[PDB]
Amino acid sequence: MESIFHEKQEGSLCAQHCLNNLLQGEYFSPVELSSIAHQLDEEERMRMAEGGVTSEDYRTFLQQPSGNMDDSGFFSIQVISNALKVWGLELILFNSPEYQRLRIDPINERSFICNYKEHWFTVRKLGKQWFNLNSLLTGPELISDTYLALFLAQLQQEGYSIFVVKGDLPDCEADQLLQMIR
């Protein structure tokens, strides 16, 4: 419980708190989140350029806030999906036809965040256990191995879009020193 690096958010910057927690630490900032948000625009842009552009359609798409943030609060999941992808991570949905009932041990993962409509909740593994880190979370909220399977199940039954970050994360000392809990 000693070295839990949780970036305590005060404000609306949910992309910031979500990612600065998700990556096991502070790696992104508001403007930078808008910069990565822009990479969706240009990535989908190139994606369309790979096949699916008449002529004006290209511009008719670019005249859009494609991931581009204005309200620094209701960031859409794409910002965590891409921000990890640019770091060498993958992001799966936990409500996918298969992924929802394929039996992925949440406790086995390294990190996954959930989004209720527009609101983020960060779930990161530290040590042998997992911690909830929310926008207005006073910090780390403990979640036992089994209570994790409980957390996730409640999410899908409550209306949470959960997202399982897959890959190698920037491991912080928190994971090493979470062998001590309460």
UniProtKB/Swiss-Prot annotation:
Mode of membrane association: Peripheral membrane protein
Q: Which reaction does it catalyse?
A: Thiol-dependent hydrolysis of ester, thioester, amide, peptide and isopeptide bonds formed by the C-terminal Gly of ubiquitin (a 76-residue protein attached to proteins as an intracellular targeting signal)
Q: Which keywords are on file for this protein? A: Hydrolase, Isopeptide bond, Lysosome, Membrane, Neurodegeneration, Nucleus, Phosphoprotein, Protease, Repeat, Spinocerebellar ataxia, Thiol protease, Transcription, Transcription regulation, Ubl conjugation, Ubl conjugation pathway
User: Could you tell me which residue ranges the Josephin domain spans?
Assistant: 1-180
Q: Which GO terms describe its molecular function?
A: ATPase binding; cysteine-type deubiquitinase activity; identical protein binding; K48-linked deubiquitinase activity; K63-linked deubiquitinase activity; ubiquitin protein ligase binding
Q: What is the top EC class of this enzyme, as a single word?
A: hydrolase
Which tissues carry this protein? Ubiquitous.
* Keyword Metal-binding among UniProt keywords: no
Fill in the subunit field for this protein: Interacts with STUB1/CHIP (when monoubiquitinated). Interacts with DNA repair proteins RAD23A and RAD23B. Interacts with BECN1 (via its poly-Gln domain). Interacts with PRKN, UBR2, VCP and tubulin. Short isoform 1 interacts with CASP7.
Q: Per its record, how is this protein called by name?
A: Ataxin-3
Q: Which organism is it from?
A: Homo sapiens (Human)
What taxonomic classification does the UniProt entry list for its organism? Answer: Eukaryota, Metazoa, Chordata, Craniata, Vertebrata
